[PDB]
Amino acid sequence: HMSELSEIDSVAGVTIYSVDGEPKSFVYKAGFAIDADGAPNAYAPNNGGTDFTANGGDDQGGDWWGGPVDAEGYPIKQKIFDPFPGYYVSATAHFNPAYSEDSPYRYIDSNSIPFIVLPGNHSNGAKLGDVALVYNEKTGDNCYAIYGDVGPSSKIGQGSVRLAQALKIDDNPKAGGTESRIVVTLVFPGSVGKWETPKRWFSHANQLTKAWGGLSRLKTLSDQL
Ligand SMILES: N[C@@H]1[C@@H](O)[C@H](O[C@@H]2O[C@H](CO)[C@@H](O[C@@H]3O[C@H](CO)[C@@H](O)[C@H](O)[C@H]3N)[C@H](O)[C@H]2N)[C@@H](CO)O[C@H]1O
């Protein structure tokens, strides 16, 4: 059966709908840009990372948003006990408080963790760490994911390198992603709202998805969007 949908928001021409019923959820069909932030090889001096350095800002003391900075405004460089020594520490809005601000281990590794981005000022009740079910209507592929990063308020439809892989979307931070509105994201706001191990949040996403009616329901719903 088709679901009953109620508009709650709109960003960049994409309508965001509350899905009537329980558990509480919202859904949107959008493109999928790559967010490599949090990957410990995303950014390095002299374009050494998997993204161009300037995608994180200016790494010579100017405005740098890709990750934490030192007392003089330069990006923190990874140490010998970090995954990519000498690369910059790239940050995500969601974080693990077990690690310090200057540690790559504090952030969500885009290479390994399926995560979605929501636009700033458009979380629609979701809190970082909440879970989601993500579906690619062109490949038939799906994955559970967390709300792991915050994007520009004027853009919607973006997620991690690993989520791209799971959806069979080109995962390259420089030329990957898609502008085609082929990804359906079902967010469960209020579902977690904290950092926890991937095994735990993935199990919780699985339990909510079962209770909500499974992928079969989301597949039918996707035809309405
Ligand atoms: N490349 C830009 C960039 O703006 C954006 O990157 C993310 O921007 C977030 C802004 O909210 C930022 O969140 C902050 O992260 C730190 C560390 O946890 C916190 O202290 C702050 O409270 C957060 N506001 C992310 O770290 C950052 N990855 C990118 C995302 O795709 O899209 C472009 O706009």
Numbering used by the authors: 0 to 224
What does the paper say about this structure?
We focus on AMGs that potentially encode chitosanase enzymes that metabolize chitin – a common carbon polymer. One expressed protein showing endo-chitosanase activity (V-Csn) is crystalized and structurally characterized at ultra-high resolution, thus representing the structure of a soil viral AMG product. The structure consisted of two non-contiguous structural domains. Our rigorous analyses not only resulted in a crystal structure of a soil viral AMG product, but also enabled us to propose the mode of action of this previously uncharacterized chitosanase enzyme in the GH75 family of glycosyl hydrolases.
Co-crystallization of both mutant proteins with chitohexaose (a β-(1-4)-linked polymer of six D-glucosamine (GlcN) residues) gave a complex with the E157Q mutant only. The substrate was located in the interdomain cleft, with three of the six GlcN residues (hereinafter named GlcN-1, GlcN-2 and GlcN-3) visible in Fo-Fc electron density, oriented such that GlcN-1 is the reducing end. The GlcN-2 and GlcN-3 residues are in a standard chair conformation, however, the density for the first observed residue (GlcN-1) suggested a distorted boat conformation. The GlcN-1 residue is anchored by a single hydrogen bond between the O6 atom and the side chain of Q157. The central GlcN residue (GlcN-2) makes hydrogen bonding interactions with the side chains of D148 and D36 via its free amine, along with a third to the backbone carbonyl oxygen of A90 from Domain-2. The GlcN-3 residue makes a hydrogen bonding interaction with the carbonyl oxygen of T91 via the O6 atom, and another to a water molecule. Although some additional Fo-Fc density was observed at the non-reducing end of GlcN-3 (the O4 atom), the sparsity of the density did not allow for a fourth GlcN to be modelled. The location of the trisaccharide fragment and the interactions it makes with the protein suggests that residues D36 and D148 form the −2 subsite and play a key role in binding and orienting the substrate (in this case via the GlcN-2 residue). The E157 residue represents the −1 subsite and may serve as the nucleophilic group responsible for bond cleavage, assuming that hydrolysis occurred at the reducing end of GlcN-1. A loop in V-Csn Domain-2 (residues Ala90 and Thr91) is involved in formation of the −2 and −3 subsites and would be expected to correctly orient this end of the chitosan substrate for optimal positioning of the −1/+1 cleavage site.
